[PDB]
């Protein structure tokens, strides 16, 4: 069982990751984990990727594909894998198919932009402590203040309404062809695809997945 898991930032696609891992006996893998593990391993693709990173440059599609190919060859992925957040472009999807990295299911996690905004914007932090708060799901005892110190809270640049909306626009635009690429491969019969309403409770999403995957 080889699964691709796509979704917008804050769509909470990972909320079903452990369920998928436990029902198939497969690891969760991401390009990030591949990079940090490859450089730590002192392997070849590692030293190469370490230079690009430390130089502050982007990693080439060519190098990423080679890392994915490397990872799914281990005994780890005898029963398959759960690829998270990759591919991100059509050319990447092609290079994977070129590298013989076939996939059984492509799951798309759907949460409308508006719900993600309210979900993300609500987050606050007390920086010197690292303590996390939320207006609606995890409210502090004293509104707009830390429960412990009593020092005022703070919000980060990454959770601001304009920053989030800007981040979602880019993703939708950038991923639009990829969603069509895999949706077409579905009706073509080279793989399977399925939209998923992530707005439902965790239990119902798990149910929806169990029938999609079987």
Residue numbers in the entry: 1 to 214
Which text from the study accompanies this structure?
AdK catalysis, which plays a vital role in cellular energy homeostasis by catalysing the reversible magnesium-dependent formation of ADP from AMP and ATP10, is dependent on distinct ATP- and AMP-binding subdomains (ATPlid and AMPbd). The turnover rate of AdK is limited by product release, and it has been shown that the microscopic step accountable for this slow release is the re-opening of the substrate-binding subdomains. AdK populates two main structural ground states: an open substrate-free state and a closed Ap5a-bound state. The ground state structures of the P177A and Y171W variants in their apo- and Ap5a-bound states were determined by X-ray crystallography.
The Tyr171 to Trp (Y171W) mutation was selected because it was anticipated that this mutation would modulate the enzyme's dynamics and facilitate stopped-flow measurements of the enzyme's ligand binding kinetics. The apo and holo structures of both variant enzymes are very similar to that of the wild type with only minor differences in the conformations of their AMPbd and ATPlid domains. Analysis of the Cα displacements in the X-ray structures of the apo- and Ap5a-bound states compared with wild-type AdK of the two AdK variants revealed that the displacements of the apo states were significantly more variable than those of the Ap5a-bound states. That is to say, the apo states are more conformationally heterogeneous. NMR chemical shift perturbation analysis also indicated that the conformations of the apo states differed more than those of the Ap5a-bound states, showing that the apo states exhibit greater structural heterogeneity both in solution and in the crystals. Inspection of the proteins' NMR spectra indicated that the Y171W mutation significantly reduced the rate constant of the enzyme's conformational interconversion (kconf) relative to that for the wild type or the P177A mutant (as discussed further below). Since a similarly strong correlation was observed between the kcat and KM values for the AdK variants examined in this work, we conclude that the effect of the Y171W and P177A replacements merely perturbs the functional energy landscape of wild-type AdK, and that the conclusions drawn from experiments on Y171W are relevant to the functional cycle of wild-type AdK.
